[PDB]
Every structure is written in C-alpha cells, then in structure tokens.
Design a protein around this ligand. Structure first.
Ligand code: ICB
Ligand code: ICB
Lengths: 231, 232
C-alpha cells in the first residue's frame, strides 16, 4: 500500500500495515524537514558507509579464502604443534589469596605450612578472608574461592601455577601477577583430556582459514598503500 | 592527513593514524570494486537512512518537549494518585512456586498445610524443587528463593500477595500471574516507607516529560495522516 508516495510490501496483518504507514509518514516528514541534510546526519551516514564498505570488502576476501584447499598435513601439524595449548580440556577448582608484598605472601604460606592436614584448607580460607586484597573475594568472604575454571580463563602465570599443583596442595612460592602476589590452594583438578584430531579438525580448518584471511588482508592493504598518495 | 584524495580527522596517535589510513585504503578499494553499487549495499544504506530519519524526527520532538514546564499540581496529583503504587520502598525476601494449573498449586499448598510450622519451609523447599516451572528456580534447586527484591520489581499481583504475608507465613490460596499460578512463602519484609514529593520530584518529572513526548508523537503522526495520500 502507499503513503503519499512511499510504497509498502490474518487480521494482525492490518495492525502491521498500520505501523508501517505510521513509519512511512514519519520518514516522509523527516525528509520534508530536511533532517538528512543536517551535518550530524551526513556524518553518521558516512561513518556507516565507511564501516560497511570495509565490511563488504572483508566478506569478499573471506569468500575467496574459503575456496582454498587446506592440506591434511597442515591441519595435522597444526594439531600436533598446538593440541596441548588449544585442545586439552581440564577444569580446576581453586582458592587464592592476593597480597601487596612477596613477604606478606611468604608469611601466609608459613602459616599454612604449620597446619595439620585436616586444618590446611580451613586455615587458607581464614587467611583469604582476613588478608586478601582481591575485592571480590574480600567482599564475598568465601575463602578466596575462584570456583571452576580452565587454563585459558585466568592470566597465564596464575593458571600455570594452579594447574601444576596436585589437589590438596598450595603454592609454596608466591606467584607474580600484576595485581600483586598470589598464594594458591588447589581443591580439585580433573585429569587433562585432549580432543582427538578428528574432533578438532573442523576447528583447525577454521583457524587456518582465519590465518589465511588475515594474511591476505594485510597483503592486499600493503599493495593498496604502495599505489596510494599518503600524506 | 590525506590518503590519495580521502581526508583523515604521541605514540597511541601514531597507531591511530595508521589504522585510519588502512581503513581509508580499504574504503577506496571497495569503491573501486563497486561494492557500493550492489543491491545489498544500497538496500542496507536505505534501511539505515530510513531508521535514522525516524530517530532524528523523534529526537527533535523530545527536544521540543523538554522545554515544556510541567505544572506543579500535575506532579502533585500524579504523586497523590500514584504514590502507593509507585513510591513505596519495601524490600522483601521470599520463596515462590510457579505452576501451570491452579489445581497443582492447591495440592501443593495443602501439602504445606499438613506440616507443622518448623517443617513447613523445608516442605516448601522440596515442593519448589519438585513442581516449580520457574526455569531459573528449577535449575538452581535453591528452593524457589528469590533473594531480596523491591515492591516495584515484580508483577503487581505477585507483589500484593507476597507483601501482604507476614514473615514465616505462606499464601493459603494460589496467586494468578501470566506465567501460571503462584504460591509464596515470606522470609523477611522491611517496613514500607513512601517517598516524599520532594524526593519523587526528579523521577516524576522524567515520567511526565516522557508522557508528553509519547503523546506529542501520536498527535503529530495523526495530523501527518490527514495530509497524506494513503491508499490500501
Ligand atoms: O584483581 C584480582 O584481585 C584478581 C586477579 C586475578 C587473576 C587470576 C585469578 C584471580 C585473580 N584475582
Ligand atoms: O517467570 C517466572 O517464573 C516468575 C514470575 C515471577 C513473579 C514474581 C517473582 C518471581 C517470578 N518468577
């Protein structure tokens, strides 16, 4: 149906057409008022245009990369070289305590060292509630509990230390993070299980295509630079 | 600085200009490749422009509305007619049970009814883990626990019944909501405090200005309808 000039294509259908009509009426009025000729409007339209030109070009390059056949050896070599970083699933449960100075940390660790086995985690819980400067933990008073997490979910040096422990054990030397020094207690830790090559393969193809696509974009962009007047 | 013809408008800045340059290069190339001449691109631009026309029109109406001073008696009559519904602060802690059909709810309530008070809430908790159709509640298995909430956060019919209970008491007849039928147990409930007009003033003005802005859009749109050739 038609609102003045503009074209639009059960009983609910009518209500929809009513909304469409109202919208066309506002569009027409906005054009009549020349709101698309305000600088703000023009600026916004060109930002959108630039963004969309860049994204369509990207899609074009991606569609050309998706055509390239990735060799089996390249996916198997990627699997062998990156499985232990990318395809091992291992959930840990741990508590931590964060402090300002490596000395404070050392003293806390000393306070745990002297506990009987039965009282180790309780002591840790108490020291976390008393001394942590992790604001989340300090506020929750949950004994420095981090819940369950993967190695690729915490900062690398924290994750390494946590996963290197065996359950029931804590770090005997403080751990350096930018937030300060951590003492970590491991409650539990699953045995690592790696995804098999056949299970990782589609993911691997996608990661190698992503790699080709980014290299291709950077190659193309450098060719465009060498043929452009930049000042 | 300038990329071919295109124009661009200390170490973060360097990276910024570089990234901007790369983007201009891509924009120019996309133009060279005539990606802006495809049906898809023109369609997208047309949609974005239409949307933005409507938004700028609205924004304009809002800018004209914000100039209007809302009369004091309007805000005071708003306050007086709507204070007990909108401006009472009352925090509650309660447990609830949602069911599809009223009969299930009644059986559940009777199941609580046959319990001594000391085992009533444990019974409520079991019943909540078993028969609730709140998926959040069903998944947490926390006994229909809702934490703390204000009186203006729940469905009206929920809040009236939950807030009419005394602490430790539960609803003796199920409560009708669109999600089904409810049974409520009241753990805690603060004493109601109604906000003063002086405290309600800034929030109220924002509500009444909103009321006008929506009324003003409808008024104008209806006039726009009478001066247009609509054909169906
Ligand atoms: O900001 C903090 O307190 C904090 C950092 C951090 C890093 C890894 C694990 C736990 C953590 N907590
Ligand atoms: O959708 C639901 O299950 C649900 C409705 C509702 C109303 C008040 C309090 C809690 C509630 N939960």
């Amino acid at each position: 149906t038609k609102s003045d000039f503009d074209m639009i294509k059960e009983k609910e259908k009518e209500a929809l057409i009513d909304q469409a009509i109202r919208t066309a009426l506002v569009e027409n009025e906005a054009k009549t008022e020349k709101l698309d000729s305000t600088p703000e409007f023009k600026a916004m339209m060109e930002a959108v245009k630039k963004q969309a030109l860049v994204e369509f070009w990207a899609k074009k390059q991606a569609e050309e990369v998706k055509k390239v056949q990735i060799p089996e050896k390249e996916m198997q070599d990627f699997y062998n070289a990156n499985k232990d970083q990318l395809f091992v699933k291992q959930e840990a449960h741990a508590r931590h305590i964060l402090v300002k100075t490596e000395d404070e940390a050392k003293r806390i660790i000393s306070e745990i060292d002297k506990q009987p086995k039965a009282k180790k985690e309780a002591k840790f819980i108490e020291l976390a509630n008393r001394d942590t400067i992790d604001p989340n933990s300090k506020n929750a008073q949950n004994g420095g509990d981090l819940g369950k997490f993967q190695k690729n979910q915490m900062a690398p040096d924290f994750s390494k230390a946590a996963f290197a422990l065996t359950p029931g054990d804590y770090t005997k030397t403080p751990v350096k993070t930018e937030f300060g020094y951590h003492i970590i207690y491991l409650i539990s830790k699953d045995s690592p299980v790696t995804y098999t090559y056949e299970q990782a393969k589609p993911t691997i193809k996608g990661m190698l295509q992503e790699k080709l696509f980014q290299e291709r974009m950077n190659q193309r962009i450098e060719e465009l630079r060498k043929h452009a007047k930049i000042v």
